Structure formats: C-alpha cells, structure tokens
C-alpha cells in the first residue's frame, strides 16, 4: 500500500510534502536537464553573437 | 644692327588639371556614402542580434 502512498519530505524549503519519491526524482532530474538545454540554446543565441 | 635677335622660349609652370565645382562634387559623395556605410555597418549589427 505504501507503494502506492504519497508521502510528505521534510525539505530545504521547510516543507512537508505529501509525494511519490518517484516524481521527486522526476523533479529533481528534469530540473537538473533544463539546466542543459536552455544554456546550450543560450550558446546557440551566443553563436548568432560571436561567429 | 638691322637684324632680328629674339629672346624666343622660356619655359616655366608647374599645374595639374582641375575643377573647383568638381571638387565638391567628390565631397559630396564622400559625406553621403559615409552616411550610408556607418548606417550599413549599425543596421546590420542590431539587425544581427538573432536571424
């Protein structure tokens, strides 16, 4: 059943968020991706610059 | 005594070809294209920020 369960962290923020650790993991690494991609096209707005 | 001595040729000038009201024509053309060209190199640059 806790399988199943949303259950809450104890977090930077001071939360108590009610999750899935899955979707934590979601978040945490599509956060760490957008990182990527969006500088990387800032570096393709930056080679419309230096080129 | 009776007879003709002449003095003939002396020879002296130093001068080049010329036009007062060609001159400014040349400035003219000078002052517009300055205009053009700075304007060319600015549009472009701003224009440049992205394709």
């Known amino acids: 059943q806790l399988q199943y369960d949303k259950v809450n962290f104890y977090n930077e923020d001071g939360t108590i968020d009610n999750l899935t650790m899955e979707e934590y993991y979601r978040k945490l690494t599509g956060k760490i991706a957008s990182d990527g ?15 | 005594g009776g007879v003709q001595v002449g003095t003939g040729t002396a020879v002296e000038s130093i001068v080049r070809l010329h036009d007062e009201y060609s001159y400014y024509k040349l400035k003219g053309a000078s002052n517009q294209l300055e205009y053009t060209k700075y304007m060319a190199s600015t549009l472009q640059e701003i224009a440049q920020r992205f394709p």
Do not use: F
Request: charged share 15%.
């Open chain 1, 37 to 51: 991609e969006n500088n990387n096209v800032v570096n393709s707005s930056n080679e419309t610059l230096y080129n």
